[PDB]
């Protein structure tokens, strides 16, 4: 339940996440058309791979995720972290593709990565 | 069972169909050399988007799939419909790269997607 | 436990593997900044598809597992097969981007995928 409840609930976001901006992006661009050809191409990728290894890490810890401790939030703000980050780039064709916005993407991607990875394992 | 049986038999379609596609447009992209370029690029990655979030949504109702109620069609039919739209599409370098193919693929993915998303979540 | 055992320390593997990998490309991307372009670019997207299907399949006769047979081994391999193998390729921005070297990650993927793919699901 506990376990159920977090990873759906995370991935729906994730999900309704990756959702909208795939389809959208796909609609976009035919619609921007250009700059908003990587744009778009962009937003996928990037998020595309927030999501694939969102994917590896969060699915795991998923079902390997028996310590009572509270660690759902990070899968809830590294979504947090992740979309406004995205959102903040968020139409820049040139580079910086970047920025304190990835410095939360990415990196918390990273800290609650890097954490709760370890946790349920060596657990 | 009910469940695993879904999850698997879907997937490996899924995954029979990710695998030839990925070594082979490999193999044919060395193979063709280039307008294949591009194509067997744009293979992998449409389709690996496509099972990107098939994987997302698929893999989790998978384990929160309680209700009774039938729904492997469209993890089966998205897969029909998403196979015939590449195969439809299927070698024109020139956008469009898209058409009533994927107004099939992609659109079922979205409903397929939107419904039992929300589903065995909402439950 | 044999089970979680497996797939966890695969998919951390492969997870160490692919996160300092991501980041860290990223990393040399604007470090180096031309040719680390692609390289970089390069080692995301093979290795995140040697991941994108890892993910399908391992994930997969994961919870689907149920025989004693050993095959964690190539879950291990592949992963063996795969790492030396972008690690080999490995700032040639010239193709080929290919060698023995996928023969072997790609390849294994491919019997270590083949097997054990078909293996828990008819069974
Ligand atoms: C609950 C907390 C208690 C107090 C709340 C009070 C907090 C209030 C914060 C007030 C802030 C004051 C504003 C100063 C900021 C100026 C920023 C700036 O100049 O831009 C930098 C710019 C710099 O831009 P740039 O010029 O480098 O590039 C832009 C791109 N070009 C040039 C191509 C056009 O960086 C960004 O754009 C980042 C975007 C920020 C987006 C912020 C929106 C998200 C915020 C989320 C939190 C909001 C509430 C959610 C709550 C939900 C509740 C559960
Ligand atoms: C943009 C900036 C960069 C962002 C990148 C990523 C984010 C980086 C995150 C960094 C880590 C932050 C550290 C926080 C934790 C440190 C505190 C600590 O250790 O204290 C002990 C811990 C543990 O609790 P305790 O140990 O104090 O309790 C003792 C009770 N016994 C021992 C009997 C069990 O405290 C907490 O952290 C509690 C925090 C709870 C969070 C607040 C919400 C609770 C309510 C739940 C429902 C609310 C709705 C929210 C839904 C959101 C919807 C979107
Ligand atoms: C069981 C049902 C009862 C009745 C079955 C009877 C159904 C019989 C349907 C007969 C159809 C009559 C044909 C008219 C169609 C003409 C289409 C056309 O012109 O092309 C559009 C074209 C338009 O092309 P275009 O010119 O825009 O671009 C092509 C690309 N260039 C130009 C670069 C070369 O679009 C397509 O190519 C789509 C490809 C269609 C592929 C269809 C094969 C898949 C069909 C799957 C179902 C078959 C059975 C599976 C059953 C399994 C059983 C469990
Ligand atoms: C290319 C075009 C676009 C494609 C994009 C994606 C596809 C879009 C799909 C759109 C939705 C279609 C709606 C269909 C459902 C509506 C019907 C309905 O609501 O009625 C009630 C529902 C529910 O059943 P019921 O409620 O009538 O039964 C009552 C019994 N009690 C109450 C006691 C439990 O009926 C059905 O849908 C039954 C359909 C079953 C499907 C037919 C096959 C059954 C046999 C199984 C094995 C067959 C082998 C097949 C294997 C395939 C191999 C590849
Ligand atoms: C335990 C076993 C018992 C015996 C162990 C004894 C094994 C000892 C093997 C000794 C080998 C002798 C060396 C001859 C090889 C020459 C290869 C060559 O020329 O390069 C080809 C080259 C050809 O290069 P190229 O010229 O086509 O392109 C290079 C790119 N450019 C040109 C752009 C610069 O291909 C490669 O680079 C492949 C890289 C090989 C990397 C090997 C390191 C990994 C080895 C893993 C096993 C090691 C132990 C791990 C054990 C862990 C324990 C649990
Ligand atoms: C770079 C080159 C290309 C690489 C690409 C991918 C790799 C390709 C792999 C190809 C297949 C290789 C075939 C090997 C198997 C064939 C042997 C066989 O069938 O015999 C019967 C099988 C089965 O056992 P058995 O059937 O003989 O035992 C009988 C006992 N009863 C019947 C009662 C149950 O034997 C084995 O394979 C045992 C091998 C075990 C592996 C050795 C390690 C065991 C110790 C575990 C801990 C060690 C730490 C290692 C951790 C690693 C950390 C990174
Ligand atoms: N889908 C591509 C995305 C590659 C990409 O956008 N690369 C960015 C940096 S990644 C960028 C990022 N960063 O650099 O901080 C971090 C990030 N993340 O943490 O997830 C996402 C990034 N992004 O822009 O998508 C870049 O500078 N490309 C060179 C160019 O445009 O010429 C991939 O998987 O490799
Ligand atoms: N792997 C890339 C694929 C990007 C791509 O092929 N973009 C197509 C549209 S997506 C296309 C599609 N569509 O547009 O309807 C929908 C689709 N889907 O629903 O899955 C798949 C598409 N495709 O061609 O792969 C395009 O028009 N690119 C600009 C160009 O070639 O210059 C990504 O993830 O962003
Ligand atoms: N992320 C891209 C990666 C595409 C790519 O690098 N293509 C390589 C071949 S794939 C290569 C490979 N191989 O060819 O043997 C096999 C492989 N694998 O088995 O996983 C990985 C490859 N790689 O270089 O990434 C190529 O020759 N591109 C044309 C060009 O650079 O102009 C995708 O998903 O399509
Ligand atoms: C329960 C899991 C939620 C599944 C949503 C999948 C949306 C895919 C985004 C790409
Ligand atoms: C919900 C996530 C929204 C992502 C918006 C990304 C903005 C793109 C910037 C490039
Ligand atoms: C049981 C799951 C089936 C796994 C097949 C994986 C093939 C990957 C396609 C890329
Ligand atoms: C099994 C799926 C086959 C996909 C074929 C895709 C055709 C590519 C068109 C571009
Ligand atoms: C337990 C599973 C291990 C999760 C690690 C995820 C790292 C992602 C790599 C991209
Ligand atoms: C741990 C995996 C390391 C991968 C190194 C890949 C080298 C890139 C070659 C292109």
Redesign the interface.
């Known amino acids: 339940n506990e376990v ?1 409840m977090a ?2 609930s995370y ?2 976001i ?2 309704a996440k ?2 909208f901006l ?2 959208a992006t ?1 609609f976009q661009r ?1 619609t921007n058309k250009d700059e908003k050809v990587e744009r778009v191409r962009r937003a ?1 990728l990037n998020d ?2 927030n ?3 969102f ?3 969060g ?2 810890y998923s ?2 995720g028996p310590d009572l401790s509270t660690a759902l939030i990070h899968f809830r703000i590294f979504v947090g972290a992740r979309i406004y980050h995205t959102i903040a780039y968020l139409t820049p064709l040139p580079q910086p593709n ?1 920025g304190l916005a990835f410095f939360v993407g ?1 990196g918390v991607t ?1 800290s609650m ?1 890097y954490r709760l ?1 370890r946790s ?2 060596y657990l």
Chains 1, 2, 3 share one sequence.
């Open positions: 159920l990873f759906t991935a729906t994730i999900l990756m959702m795939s389809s796909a035919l996928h595309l791979e999501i694939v290894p994917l590896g890490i699915l795991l079902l390997s970047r990415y990273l990565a990875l349920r394992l």
